[PDB]
Write a protein that binds this ligand. Structure first.
Ligand SMILES: Nc1ncnc2c1ncn2[C@@H]1O[C@H](COP(=O)(O)OP(=O)(O)CP(=O)(O)O)[C@@H](O)[C@H]1O
Ligand SMILES: Nc1ncnc2c1ncn2[C@@H]1O[C@H](COP(=O)(O)OP(=O)(O)CP(=O)(O)O)[C@@H](O)[C@H]1O
Ligand SMILES: [Co+2]
Ligand SMILES: [Mg+2]
Ligand SMILES: [Mg+2]
Lengths: 282, 274
């Protein structure tokens, strides 16, 4: 049993802690590791409140998942900082933010060239396919453009394993826009959540649009999706000059199909799309 | 918190092609049939039956790579462990080795300074990480052929075949290793630094390795002059000073990698992003 231990990073080795992002459940900060001399990201529980023991278990579980799931397109975990009053997952620092920022910050990024977009889509599928091929399979359950991070040369690192589950009545978690309709309510199709999210991501990458942008109430989105409505496919959302437009639309519509049986495995998706990805030059 | 190294069944390796044969094994490219990625496979000779001592060497190397994972270390993806096949499966590095970058002058007429300095910085970060493990991992075979370059020319340190937990060419070896070794890696790094900044083969004109060994034991080192190291090398004086400490006759005069990074960080910092 060849084993790799996740390093424990003592608190005094984290220098220059700076707020990057605060959320509901925790905070992401940048830091430098004083000994390794690299920039890191630290995803930690709130510094304000005392540390709840159930919150501690959630962080340890996420850290273990990241550690086990390591692969070319998955955010590398560097260690865990586990202290009486501080608990943080230490990962590689991603200099180029998230796919969300790339797609929707149109002043910062006026042009996002097709080969880059297709490489991003290919790398996401490779990352998730890897997760689904683990024993037991790891299901991400929160794939979205905000959780696809971009390294120094805009290669994909899938992040945020907070809702992930090993496949071994309540529905799984997720973000509503990227969630298939069968996951909305209590009461086998669990494995087809990630591909649905990927289809919405693909639509979002090729359009540079917010899915369901005109729909102001998320409950209306949920009602419409449960009736089979999806982000709009027309000349306006998806211009005619998108490379391999017909094949990509066909794949999207299978990926987000109402019937989960009509959605491909990620392996199937890769087999179907490899000829498309291959047409692009380095 | 434990991570298991995957066992990759032989039937999942497709399109096996010879890349490089050495004395102890062979490196082949392949595709993983399920993961749909290109891989490199470092395996024992397909011709001979598999000696059990050779098997243990490969397993030991695989374990070291698995434990040593870090941003500047070659990622191991799994082990293929079969009755008649034994191979370490790693990420495929598209841009070869630092050796090829430096010495294939038709293929690479210009290697710009910011790239060279970034490479030197990343090597030191990789080795510093190894030396900071508990117990420390000593590489003991650092050379330009063992520094691999990924798709955007970032460093992955490879070849852990001679590595040791702290409980072939002699040009990168300090003299105390062959006098008739905690400071071995930094000595190799000093020679690598000279090689990166010069684009020259260390001791190129010395035809007998025994002459190299004798000369080094007497304090001779790769030549530092205007010809080997041009005056227009950024931070030339500081870099020469560092090199000469890194390969100092007395191992006590050679820095830790942490010390080397502390001393060189201001130099590395002057360069803009590529
Ligand atoms: N390694 C990393 N490098 C650089 N930035 C990172 C990073 N990890 C996270 N971030 C930034 O922090 C933000 C939140 O990270 P993440 O999604 O994992 O936290 P979280 O799970 O607590 C949000 P939520 O509670 O909504 O699920 C990311 O969108 C990104 O901007
Ligand atoms: N992941 C990888 N990706 C691409 N090429 C690789 C590679 N790993 C090794 N190579 C190539 O094979 C060559 C030899 O690899 P490596 O040094 O690890 O084997 P080895 O230890 O058997 C040689 P020696 O017997 O001299 O020690 C490398 O220099 C490189 O050209
Ligand atoms: Co498990
Ligand atoms: Mg989350
Ligand atoms: Mg070797």
């Amino acid at each position: 049993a060849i084993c790799s231990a996740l390093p424990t990073i003592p608190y005094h080795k984290l220098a220059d802690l700076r707020y990057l992002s605060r959320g509901a459940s925790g905070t992401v900060s940048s830091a430098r590791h004083a000994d390794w001399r690299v920039q890191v990201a630290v995803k930690h529980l709130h510094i304000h409140t005392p540390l709840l023991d159930s919150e501690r278990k959630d962080v340890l579980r996420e850290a273990e998942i990241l550690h086990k799931a390591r692969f070319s397109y998955i955010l590398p975990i560097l260690g865990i900082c586990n202290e009486p009053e501080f608990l943080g997952i230490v990962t590689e620092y991603m200099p180029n933010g998230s796919l969300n920022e790339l797609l929707h910050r149109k002043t910062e990024y006026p042009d996002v060239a097709w080969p880059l977009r297709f490489r991003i889509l290919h790398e996401i599928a490779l990352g998730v396919n890897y997760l689904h091929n683990m024993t037991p399979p790891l299901l991400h359950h929160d794939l979205k453009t905000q959780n696809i991070l971009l390294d120094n040369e805009f290669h994909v690192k899938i992040a945020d394993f907070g809702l992930s589950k090993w496949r071994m009545s309540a529905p799984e978690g997720g973000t509503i826009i990227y969630m298939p309709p069968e996951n909305y309510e209590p009461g086998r199709a669990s494995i087809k959540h990630d591909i649905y999210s990927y289809a919405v991501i693909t639509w979002e990458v090729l359009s540079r649009k917010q899915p369901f942008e005109d729909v102001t109430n998320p409950l209306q989105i949920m009602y419409s999706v449960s009736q089979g409505h999806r982000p709009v496919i027309n000349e306006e959302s998806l211009p005619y000059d998108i490379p391999h437009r017909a094949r990509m639309i066909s794949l999207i519509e299978s990926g987000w199909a109402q019937n989960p049986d009509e959605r491909p495995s990620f392996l199937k998706c890769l087999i179907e799309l490899e000829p498309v990805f291959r047409t692009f030059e380095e």
